[PDB]
Design an enzyme around this catalytic site. Structure first.
Site, PDB file in Angstrom:
ATOM      1  N   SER A  24      39.923 -31.298-109.163  1.00 42.32           N
ATOM      2  CA  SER A  24      38.537 -31.722-109.756  1.00 42.32           C
ATOM      3  C   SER A  24      37.787 -30.844-110.703  1.00 42.32           C
ATOM      4  O   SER A  24      37.442 -30.892-111.988  1.00 42.32           O
ATOM      5  CB  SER A  24      37.612 -32.285-108.747  1.00 42.32           C
ATOM      6  OG  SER A  24      36.642 -33.385-109.321  1.00 42.32           O
ATOM      7  N   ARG A  82      29.255 -28.697-110.040  1.00 42.92           N
ATOM      8  CA  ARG A  82      29.248 -29.573-108.833  1.00 42.92           C
ATOM      9  C   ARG A  82      28.621 -30.557-109.042  1.00 42.92           C
ATOM     10  O   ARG A  82      28.930 -31.852-108.780  1.00 42.92           O
ATOM     11  CB  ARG A  82      28.800 -28.827-107.623  1.00 42.92           C
ATOM     12  CG  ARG A  82      29.186 -29.337-106.216  1.00 42.92           C
ATOM     13  CD  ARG A  82      28.940 -28.705-104.941  1.00 42.92           C
ATOM     14  NE  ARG A  82      29.520 -29.441-103.947  1.00 42.92           N
ATOM     15  CZ  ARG A  82      30.450 -28.664-103.413  1.00 42.92           C
ATOM     16  NH1 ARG A  82      31.071 -27.580-103.841  1.00 42.92           N
ATOM     17  NH2 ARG A  82      31.022 -29.460-102.237  1.00 42.92           N
ATOM     18  N   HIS A 140      30.803 -32.950-111.219  1.00 47.35           N
ATOM     19  CA  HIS A 140      31.992 -33.553-110.144  1.00 47.35           C
ATOM     20  C   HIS A 140      31.246 -34.798-109.424  1.00 47.35           C
ATOM     21  O   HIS A 140      31.764 -35.964-109.449  1.00 47.35           O
ATOM     22  CB  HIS A 140      32.330 -32.350-109.258  1.00 47.35           C
ATOM     23  CG  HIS A 140      33.044 -33.026-107.952  1.00 47.35           C
ATOM     24  ND1 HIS A 140      34.275 -32.980-107.870  1.00 47.35           N
ATOM     25  CD2 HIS A 140      32.631 -32.866-106.773  1.00 47.35           C
ATOM     26  CE1 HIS A 140      34.734 -33.132-106.532  1.00 47.35           C
ATOM     27  NE2 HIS A 140      33.395 -33.236-106.122  1.00 47.35           N
TER      28      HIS A 140
HETATM   29  C1  LIG Z   1      29.995 -32.510 -99.348  1.00 45.91           C
HETATM   30  C2  LIG Z   1      28.948 -33.397 -99.228  1.00 45.91           C
HETATM   31  C3  LIG Z   1      28.764 -34.772 -99.701  1.00 45.91           C
HETATM   32  C4  LIG Z   1      30.276 -35.148-100.466  1.00 45.91           C
HETATM   33  C5  LIG Z   1      31.009 -35.784 -99.658  1.00 45.91           C
HETATM   34  N1  LIG Z   1      32.365 -36.009 -99.937  1.00 45.91           N
HETATM   35  C6  LIG Z   1      33.639 -36.062 -99.211  1.00 45.91           C
HETATM   36  C7  LIG Z   1      33.657 -37.638 -98.788  1.00 45.91           C
HETATM   37  C8  LIG Z   1      34.725 -35.349 -99.448  1.00 45.91           C
HETATM   38  N2  LIG Z   1      34.896 -35.435-100.971  1.00 45.91           N
HETATM   39  C9  LIG Z   1      36.254 -35.453-101.351  1.00 45.91           C
HETATM   40  C10 LIG Z   1      36.516 -35.373-102.652  1.00 45.91           C
HETATM   41  C11 LIG Z   1      36.579 -34.010-103.114  1.00 45.91           C
HETATM   42  C12 LIG Z   1      35.420 -35.950-103.586  1.00 45.91           C
HETATM   43  C13 LIG Z   1      35.700 -36.706-104.828  1.00 45.91           C
HETATM   44  C14 LIG Z   1      37.045 -37.108-105.471  1.00 45.91           C
HETATM   45  C15 LIG Z   1      37.711 -37.209-106.768  1.00 45.91           C
HETATM   46  C16 LIG Z   1      37.491 -35.800-107.297  1.00 45.91           C
HETATM   47  O1  LIG Z   1      37.289 -34.954-106.362  1.00 45.91           O
HETATM   48  O2  LIG Z   1      37.373 -35.782-108.729  1.00 45.91           O
HETATM   49  C17 LIG Z   1      34.419 -37.185-105.485  1.00 45.91           C
HETATM   50  C18 LIG Z   1      34.555 -38.983-104.762  1.00 45.91           C
HETATM   51  C19 LIG Z   1      33.964 -36.923-106.657  1.00 45.91           C
HETATM   52  C20 LIG Z   1      33.520 -36.636-104.062  1.00 45.91           C
HETATM   53  N3  LIG Z   1      34.169 -35.732-103.318  1.00 45.91           N
HETATM   54  C21 LIG Z   1      31.944 -36.839-104.590  1.00 45.91           C
HETATM   55  C22 LIG Z   1      30.968 -36.481-103.847  1.00 45.91           C
HETATM   56  N4  LIG Z   1      31.229 -35.706-102.488  1.00 45.91           N
HETATM   57  C23 LIG Z   1      30.189 -35.323-102.067  1.00 45.91           C
HETATM   58  C24 LIG Z   1      29.079 -35.498-103.363  1.00 45.91           C
HETATM   59  C25 LIG Z   1      27.540 -35.543-102.897  1.00 45.91           C
HETATM   60  C26 LIG Z   1      29.234 -34.038-103.883  1.00 45.91           C
HETATM   61  C27 LIG Z   1      29.116 -32.692-103.173  1.00 45.91           C
HETATM   62  O3  LIG Z   1      28.224 -32.230-102.986  1.00 45.91           O
HETATM   63  O4  LIG Z   1      30.464 -32.083-102.451  1.00 45.91           O
HETATM   64  C28 LIG Z   1      29.773 -36.631-103.987  1.00 45.91           C
HETATM   65  C29 LIG Z   1      29.211 -37.841-103.682  1.00 45.91           C
HETATM   66  C30 LIG Z   1      29.314 -38.942-104.753  1.00 45.91           C
HETATM   67  C31 LIG Z   1      28.305 -40.130-104.416  1.00 45.91           C
HETATM   68  O5  LIG Z   1      27.897 -40.355-103.312  1.00 45.91           O
HETATM   69  O6  LIG Z   1      28.114 -41.069-105.261  1.00 45.91           O
HETATM   70  C32 LIG Z   1      37.000 -35.182 -99.978  1.00 45.91           C
HETATM   71  C33 LIG Z   1      37.698 -33.888 -99.900  1.00 45.91           C
HETATM   72  C34 LIG Z   1      38.103 -36.252-100.251  1.00 45.91           C
HETATM   73  C35 LIG Z   1      37.904 -37.790-100.521  1.00 45.91           C
HETATM   74  C36 LIG Z   1      39.008 -38.506-101.507  1.00 45.91           C
HETATM   75  O7  LIG Z   1      39.020 -37.724-102.681  1.00 45.91           O
HETATM   76  O8  LIG Z   1      39.178 -39.579-101.361  1.00 45.91           O
HETATM   77  C37 LIG Z   1      35.979 -35.785 -98.907  1.00 45.91           C
HETATM   78  C38 LIG Z   1      36.397 -35.211 -97.437  1.00 45.91           C
HETATM   79  C39 LIG Z   1      37.406 -36.004 -96.783  1.00 45.91           C
HETATM   80  O9  LIG Z   1      37.509 -37.367 -96.755  1.00 45.91           O
HETATM   81  O10 LIG Z   1      38.284 -35.449 -96.070  1.00 45.91           O
HETATM   82  C40 LIG Z   1      32.684 -35.725 -97.638  1.00 45.91           C
HETATM   83  C41 LIG Z   1      33.141 -36.489 -96.388  1.00 45.91           C
HETATM   84  C42 LIG Z   1      32.830 -34.122 -97.529  1.00 45.91           C
HETATM   85  C43 LIG Z   1      32.020 -33.459 -96.260  1.00 45.91           C
HETATM   86  O11 LIG Z   1      31.325 -34.017 -95.530  1.00 45.91           O
HETATM   87  O12 LIG Z   1      32.598 -32.410 -96.011  1.00 45.91           O
HETATM   88  C44 LIG Z   1      31.152 -35.916 -98.134  1.00 45.91           C
HETATM   89  C45 LIG Z   1      30.425 -37.218 -97.640  1.00 45.91           C
HETATM   90  C46 LIG Z   1      29.078 -37.780 -98.154  1.00 45.91           C
HETATM   91  C47 LIG Z   1      28.152 -38.832 -97.575  1.00 45.91           C
HETATM   92  O13 LIG Z   1      28.859 -39.177 -96.259  1.00 45.91           O
HETATM   93  O14 LIG Z   1      27.225 -39.075 -98.205  1.00 45.91           O
END
Ligand SMILES: C=CC/C1=C2/N[C@@](C)([C@@H]3N=C([C@H](C)C4=C(CCC(=O)O)C(C)(C)C(=N4)/C=C4N=C1[C@@](C)(CC(=O)O)[C@@H]\4CCC(=O)O)[C@](C)(CCC(=O)O)[C@H]3CC(=O)O)[C@@](C)(CC(=O)O)[C@@H]2CCC(=O)O
Ligand SMILES: C=CC/C1=C2/N[C@@](C)([C@@H]3N=C([C@H](C)C4=C(CCC(=O)O)C(C)(C)C(=N4)/C=C4N=C1[C@@](C)(CC(=O)O)[C@@H]\4CCC(=O)O)[C@](C)(CCC(=O)O)[C@H]3CC(=O)O)[C@@](C)(CC(=O)O)[C@@H]2CCC(=O)O
Lengths: 208, 208
Positions: A15, A38, A41
């Site tokens: 990403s 970020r 992203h």
């Molecule tokens: C790490 C914290 C939040 C987060 C998470 N995102 C996670 C869902 C992780 N985020 C993931 C990926 C990088 C992710 C994205 C996927 C597509 C892409 O990367 O371009 C996109 C969808 C671009 C993405 N991550 C986007 C986001 N992830 C985020 C955010 C806030 C960006 C960030 O700061 O890393 C942002 C929010 C998007 C939204 O609400 O509209 C994991 C590694 C895989 C999920 C997948 O690709 O299907 C995921 C961890 C896991 O399921 O094993 C989270 C559980 C991690 C944690 O607590 O350590 C976790 C869940 C948040 C929740 O429960 O509100």
């Protein structure tokens, strides 16, 4: 069945690489560039970087305040829930006062929104805080007015990224003109809890 | 001090009016149009409507399932926290299993993400549910595979709006091609927890 990539640590690296191949990031300092990446992203939107503005020194100052144990004060529960507890460097408190049972009556008496009135309850935690406003333009404008009193405790930094059609752009342009403490914004209508969270998570930990 | 609008009920009406004056909404049925308006509101982005697609009947079906007491199954805590408990018509349960203490070990054994493995725990609540996926493309692709088994309980509807660069667009195009149950998506990279929440909140209550 359907086939797709299942290694999330790989997904992240991919990403970030895609964003750095497509986005116009040359004007940002190294500390700013990581935050921007970020935010893009989280938004799924290359082009977002044409709208971000930082005060000089903000990214450095905010990462220092977090490494020193500063709390994180959030306008909305969608912000507080998003912050990654694992990335926090110093057992940092993550606080949202929006659902405090005193907020509905305080808001009526202030003739203001609940989002705004809840900031009154930040006072004891505000000195040295990192402020994360991802939703409510009224909260950001009320915070500016709070800080016009010299007796109000002052945060270390403000991440001012409310979203929307009414008030949002104006509150972020007022933040930047006022320059109370080091700040970052998304100019115009774009912003929101995801972009705000992503900024906090980028600042909290040196690893991407 | 700074002057700005403080009546939030007024702010909402104004936001919606501005969106309806600027956006290209003629192709949506009345039930679809209300959902779209709220998604644009949440995103701060007129133009978003050029990317939304609904199955025929989805908006009607989803509002019916909610009025009948259906739960709401959410990929991420940023989704579950955003849903407005006040707008729910029938004491609806709002569920996210992502932080269940069994999910890290199940994900290791499945060779999948935590977001995806947590869907296994939805099984007892899946029959007749409204699914709200705002983050994880892996969760949406894993859900498609789940539903290829005739023994898996089937939801009433899916709001499929994951965001991002890797997997997101592909998972939403696969949802629509597969047509398992009535669906809505944001085609391409855009999406996220705010837009998803806004869709659920629009469907839950007939008043805007
Ligand atoms: C790490 C914290 C939040 C987060 C998470 N995102 C996670 C869902 C992780 N985020 C993931 C990926 C990088 C992710 C994205 C996927 C597509 C892409 O990367 O371009 C996109 C969808 C671009 C993405 N991550 C986007 C986001 N992830 C985020 C955010 C806030 C960006 C960030 O700061 O890393 C942002 C929010 C998007 C939204 O609400 O509209 C994991 C590694 C895989 C999920 C997948 O690709 O299907 C995921 C961890 C896991 O399921 O094993 C989270 C559980 C991690 C944690 O607590 O350590 C976790 C869940 C948040 C929740 O429960 O509100
Ligand atoms: C109603 C539920 C969620 C929500 C809220 N938003 C609220 C903050 C309300 N949302 C508000 C306004 C309409 C709002 C927006 C302002 C600019 C504009 O309207 O164009 C924008 C910023 C466009 C906006 N509302 C955007 C959003 N509001 C939403 C969302 C999900 C859209 C929706 O479905 O109504 C979406 C999330 C944006 C994001 O996270 O990135 C209130 C009425 C005023 C805040 C202000 O304008 O400064 C606010 C209620 C209050 O403080 O008295 C919330 C507390 C309501 C509730 O629980 O009943 C509540 C707080 C959510 C949280 O704690 O996660």
């Amino acid at each position: 069945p359907h086939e797709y990539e299942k290694d999330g640590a790989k997904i992240y690296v991919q990403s970030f690489a895609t964003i750095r191949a497509e986005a116009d990031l040359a004007r940002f300092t190294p500390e700013e560039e990581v935050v921007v990446v970020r935010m893009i992203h989280a938004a799924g939107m290359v082009g977002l970087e044409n709208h971000v503005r930082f005060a000089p020194g903000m990214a450095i100052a905010a990462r220092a305040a977090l490494e020193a144990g500063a709390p994180i004060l959030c306008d909305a529960r969608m912000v507080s829930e998003g912050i990654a507890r694992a990335r926090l460097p110093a057992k940092n408190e993550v606080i949202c006062t929006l659902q405090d049972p005193r907020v509905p009556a305080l808001a009526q008496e202030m003739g203001n929104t609940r989002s705004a009135a809840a900031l009154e309850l930040w006072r004891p935690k505000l000195e040295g805080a990192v402020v994360a406003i991802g939703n409510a333009p009224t909260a950001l404008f009320h915070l500016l007015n709070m800080l016009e009193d010299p007796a109000c405790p002052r945060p270390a930094a403000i991440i001012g990224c409310p979203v929307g059609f009414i008030g949002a752009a104006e509150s972020k342009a007022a933040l930047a003109v006022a320059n109370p403490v080091p700040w970052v914004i998304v100019e115009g209508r774009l912003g929101g809890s995801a972009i705000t969270v992503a900024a906090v998570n980028a600042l909290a930990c040196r690893k991407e």
